[PDB]
Amino acid sequence: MALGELKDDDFEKISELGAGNGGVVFKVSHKPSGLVMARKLIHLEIKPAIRNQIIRELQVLHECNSPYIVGFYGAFYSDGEISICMEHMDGGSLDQVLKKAGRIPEQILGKVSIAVIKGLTYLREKHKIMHRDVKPSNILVNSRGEIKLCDFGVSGQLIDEMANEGTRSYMSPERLQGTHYSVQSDIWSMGLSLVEMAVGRYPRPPMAIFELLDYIVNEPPPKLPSAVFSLEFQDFVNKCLIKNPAERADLKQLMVHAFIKRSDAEEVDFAGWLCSTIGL
Ligand SMILES: Nc1ncnc2c1ncn2[C@@H]1O[C@H](COP(=O)(O)OP(=O)(O)OP(=O)(O)O)[C@@H](O)[C@H]1O
Ligand SMILES: O=C(NOC[C@@H](O)CO)c1ccc(F)c(F)c1Nc1ccc(I)cc1F
Ligand SMILES: [Mg+2]
């Protein structure tokens, strides 16, 4: 097919695009094709059987086709690590962006809201995929002003192997109390992403981890400063963060919210905003 059998020898490392919990990501040249990719190495110590079922489950990403979903090129195993080769987003994640910007303005975050809502509507409706880890380091951006999701849970096995070797500060209250994952949880992590990027920091009083986890279950959700953000943005984020998942807005409902309709209509030169702030 398009790329054939992908192997470690074909790739030359260009730079390192960063690291997180359990994996490193490099910008690479797939030399035979001339493709520039992002290569992400994942160390899992797993019985061969279980690894191959991951790499096969990962092939469902070849069928993922959305302007709001990072593109997939392949997935192989070499030397204890699974490689997931993907489209290289040249603006990095909103995480790295927020470090540089300090705060991301509301108007830009309305473009992210739209891209995030549409990305997730795509997964749910086309592929019956829930994201499972919406947060700003898994929302990625490029010099073409594009905004895309990665790191969603296509693979059941990888979900399982990941849960037992996460980002608990980003899980909704009900998920924290041990409930099975739902779309309404993608939405909380959306809400929470939008408030963190807006205010410039993880939007909870500082505390020890186990305290934070009960804090989230027990205490009322975060909110925007009312002074410096439109009422429609405050509503939008509030509806994403209702603690009862039954009463939280769903994606249908968010897509026609005052703040989304307002932002859709706006003309934001997000690409130039970006290239300005990260020196691209
Ligand atoms: N396709 C890509 N293009 C450009 N940069 C990427 C891509 N995928 C990941 N990165 C960068 O690599 C980093 C590593 O992401 P990874 O999924 O390795 O961890 P994370 O999401 O940052 O954190 P965690 O592991 O704690 O969830 C990200 O911060 C992002 O900057
Ligand atoms: O990589 C993922 N999480 O990473 C967190 C970090 O601790 C390790 O990097 C991850 C988790 C579950 C799953 F099903 C995936 F497919 C993942 N990878 C993944 C998914 C879609 C694209 I387009 C590109 C990708 F790479
Ligand atoms: Mg990531």
Side-chain angles (χ1 to χ4, degrees), residues 235-247:
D235 206 59
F236 179 76
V237 140
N238 283 171
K239 277 171 172 46
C240 286
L241 294 166
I242 306 314
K243 300 182 66 196
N244 188 358
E247 293 178 73

Side-chain angles (χ1 to χ4, degrees), residues 15-18 25-28 36-39 66-73 85-94 96-97 115 137-151 270 274 278 280:
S15 53
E16 189 170 321
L17 295 150
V25 186
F26 296 105
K27 189 198 194 188
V28 294
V36 178
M37 317 190 173
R39 196 204 179 164
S66 183
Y68 321 96
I69 303 298
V70 180
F72 175 71
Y73 291 126
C85 295
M86 100 209 87
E87 179 190 2
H88 161 245
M89 306 294 291
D90 75 339
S93 40
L94 287 195
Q96 294 179 301
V97 193
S137 82
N138 295 333
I139 297 162
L140 305 169
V141 295
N142 56 38
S143 48
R144 285 191 291 192
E146 284 172 313
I147 310 171
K148 295 189 190 142
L149 312 172
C150 60
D151 294 3
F270 171 54
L274 193 59
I278 65 182
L280 236 167

Side-chain angles (χ1 to χ4, degrees), residues 168 171-181 217:
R168 349 197 15 74
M171 317 182 163
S172 56
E174 78 277 357
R175 174 73 196 147
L176 282 187
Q177 304 182 95
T179 298
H180 291 144
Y181 207 91
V217 164

